[PDB]
């Protein structure tokens, strides 16, 4: 059996800038049994029918998992723009897969604020599809060099979601799993 349980039922998820990817091959996949629970608050397939997966044989299945805001789940789709789509995780235009996201306010939100989840805020250019940028270099938004220290025209490129349980659904954490066939 394919280890879809390890991807979806993982205790800890990755940040969107350092998104995890799991290669899945050489196994029997319970495709139609993935969508048996009502927990998925977003299930959008692109290029494939979610009902026609049980009759399709693929060479590889890449499971990309991370955590983003609720209002940013709309960016996990081909041809989207913003901060998550441009600087953190970018899907190609001819994307062939399914995007599965669900609210995880119970786990990924803490009373004092969960600062483990971060997103890239500044970048000199947009990401190419499926490019992961994990550099923590001080961003030089201005003339003078930074020399590894932040100040005027020098900022840290990773901001953190202050995940608290009191936040609105648009600011609560959502665990995303992008299956690519």
């Amino acid at each position, epitope marked *: 059996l394919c280890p879809f349980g390890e991807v979806f039922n993982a205790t800890r998820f990755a940040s969107v800038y350092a998104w995890n990817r799991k290669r899945i091959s050489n196994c029997v996949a319970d495709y139609s049994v993935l969508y048996n629970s009502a927990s998925f608050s977003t299930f959008k397939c692109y290029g494939v029918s979610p009902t026609k997966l049980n009759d399709l044989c693929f060479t590889n299945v890449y499971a990309d998992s991370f955590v983003i805001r609720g209002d940013e789940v709309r960016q996990i789709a081909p041809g989207q723009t913003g901060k998550i789509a441009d600087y953190n995780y970018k899907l190609p235009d001819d994307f062939t897969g399914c995007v599965i996201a669900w609210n995880s306010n119970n786990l990924d939100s803490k*009373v*004092g604020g969960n*600062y*483990n989840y*971060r997103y890239r805020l500044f970048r000199k250019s947009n990401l190419k599809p499926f490019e992961r940028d994990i550099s*923590t*270099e001080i961003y030089q938004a201005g003339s003078k060099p930074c020399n*590894g220290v*932040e100040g005027f025209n020098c900022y840290f490129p990773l901001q953190s979601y202050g995940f608290q349980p009191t936040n609105g659904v648009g600011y609560q954490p959502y665990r995303v799993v992008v299956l690519s066939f």
Partner: antibody
Amino acid sequence: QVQLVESGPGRVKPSQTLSLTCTVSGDSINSGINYWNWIRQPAGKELEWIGRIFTSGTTHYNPSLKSRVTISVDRSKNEFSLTLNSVTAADTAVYFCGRGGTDDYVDYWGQGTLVTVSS
Amino acid sequence: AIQMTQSPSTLSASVGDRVTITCRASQDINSWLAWYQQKPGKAPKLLIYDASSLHSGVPTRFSGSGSGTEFTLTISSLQPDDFASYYCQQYKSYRTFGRGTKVEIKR
């Protein structure tokens, strides 16, 4: 690997301000994803988390010590230090600094320094 | 704050026995737990995080289980290097430690 060494006066007086500095060698303090922590352990008691500083300067404190604790970073010297003011006799403990790749636990620790509080 | 009640306080064991230490959270902490080992006079060493994930370099005889409010650290075959103190730390709301469990030599 990351090596952390604690330094500071081990004989602070009551109501004064306790200051301790952790020298980080082997890894940089102003790059990467690191959570530089302060943990203290009274003699014969359990561990108590003081607070953390992320590589970007953002701090997170134990709520019981939030009003007396300030943890800063000297990026030139690649050190981070802890200041605890209004110190009473109950602040006598062994103080460790530590690195953590997450805001959750501490995987690297220092030898720990003893700080005594008495008149 | 979340209070960690650890049991038993003191534990007598022999080399090769199966040691079980339990940690109880005052409220639901999901699976956000850690286990440390500390010998007298030295710095603590990380054993388990996320309740069940073994820290790199830790012997496989250590195992962490449990979720919600009940957690258990199990040592399959005890060894002389394992006679120390063990703490559980939650990180569901800030970071709180349990009072610890001491594993002593039985005679």
